[PDB]
UniProtKB/Swiss-Prot annotation, chain A:
Keywords: Chloroplast, Fatty acid biosynthesis, Fatty acid metabolism, Hydrolase, Lipid biosynthesis, Lipid metabolism, Plastid, Transit peptide
Subcellular location(s) per record: Plastid, Chloroplast
Protein's job: Plays an essential role in chain termination during de novo fatty acid synthesis. Possesses high thioesterase activity for oleoyl-ACP versus other acyl-ACPs. Substrate preference is 18:1 > 18:0 > 16:1.
UniProt record similarity statement: Belongs to the acyl-ACP thioesterase family.
Protein name: Oleoyl-acyl carrier protein thioesterase 1, chloroplastic
Shown chain mapped onto the complete sequence: 75 to 359 of 362
This protein's encoding gene: FATA
Biological process (GO), any one: fatty acid biosynthetic process
Amino acid sequence: GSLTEDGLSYKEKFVVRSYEVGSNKTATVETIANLLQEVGCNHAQSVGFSATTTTMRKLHLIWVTARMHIEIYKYPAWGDVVEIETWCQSEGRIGTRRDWILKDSVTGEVTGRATSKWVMMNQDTRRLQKVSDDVRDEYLVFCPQEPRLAFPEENNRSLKKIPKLEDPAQYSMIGLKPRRADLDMNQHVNNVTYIGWVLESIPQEIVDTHELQVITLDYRRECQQDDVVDSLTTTTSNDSQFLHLLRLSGDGQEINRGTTLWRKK
Amino acid sequence: GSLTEDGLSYKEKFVVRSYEVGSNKTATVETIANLLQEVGCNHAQSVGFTTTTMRKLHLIWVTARMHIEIYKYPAWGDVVEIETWCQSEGRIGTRRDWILKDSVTGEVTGRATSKWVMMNQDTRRLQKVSDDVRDEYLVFCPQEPRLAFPEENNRSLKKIPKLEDPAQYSMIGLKPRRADLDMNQHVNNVTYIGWVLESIPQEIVDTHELQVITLDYRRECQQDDVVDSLTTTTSDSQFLHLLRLSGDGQEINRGTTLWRKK
Ligand SMILES: Nc1ccc(F)cc1C(=O)O
Ligand SMILES: Nc1ccc(F)cc1C(=O)O
């Protein structure tokens, strides 16, 4: 991959692998989510980061995902080349945003798009805080000055408030535990694992007749290596829509809430 | 990737990804195992592939054994080159071997071998190969032996014993999710490597690095099955492994691992 001519975004190409495809012979949404994270990491590395800045490392401050929103129009097939362009943008003191555009390499068409909201937090105490001026100035040189949105629409799905699922759930998947392949280099559960855990409670019939179009996910609390999760789903709706809740098996403490939209094959 | 000049093997390069690395900032053995399978699939596709005779007779190739030896795990951002090739073992089945190299130095950083057997897709019955089907894949294999582990009496051909209860370590209630399934809805063979390593204690992960893993495949785990991973120390540190169904205790896999001090 490489930064574009103006140096304000990063582009990378990926060949879809055989173990990356699902039941439809096309890349899974988890595989796409991993590729979005991989291009994000290569963008951060290409501009000097390791995505903490000099001032963030001094204050023990990290960037944490608060929300992820993915919309796929066409999942790429095994052997296909997919091009992803990513860029960052400051949202004042609330935090930062990373947006992605997915394209089919041959036709040049937009086959998917994604947006994510990130917040600042102390690494040790887990306390969220507003972005300071010294931090904001350090990364503003790597972001486009005028707004560049992946979801520009006046009433886009990426900014909608997600409600809390009321018991009893229509569908559930109980006792989900992360293995070591679900952890990153710093031993934290990968943010992509929670997408998999959310989709564990979608019934087999929906998987058979429908294809996933949109997934919006709110991150409330992280799941530890020795924690156990319960994935809940209720139908809220041709198109099918769902409400999602991930919580700890014991106390019922919320770790994630979300929505999915499925279209008939 | 591409077939080599003689067309009897296939080479492919991979850039190690950020989500592919573990606690040591280097690619996991599961990531390596996925890359071995990915280069195997690209080799099969580049030569026309199951053969034509196998398709009408409802026959498939199934993994019976996997043996991986890693000398140096590649770091995030490193380019790793894998060369793979097939070879007939007469009527017993086929063998696929791999060699892993560091792209910059050209050194061998790892090697793997796998034994495959013929099986009816519907009845799950072994039944040896035939002779008619060999005159279809012998043209894609080197004629003289080409072994990834050539040494007479090496680790890749050793008989694995059955773990006796009580196990020293265990991890119970392991279930596959949809990301653990392949396009045909069968549990990925790499998931069982992860399930085996779930019962290695945290202390071994902290002080040691995995060098060798030999795995026997006895039975497949279904989408609605639950697994228990057992481990006992047999000794460098060496371990004996057993994966079995949570209920009846039916064996699905047995294995060994060898760990080197960091
Ligand atoms: N891999 C998956 C994960 C979740 C899901 F709901 C469906 C699939 C699939 O293979 O279509
Ligand atoms: N990913 C892993 C899976 C099993 C294991 F025993 C260790 C690791 C690691 O990150 O070193």
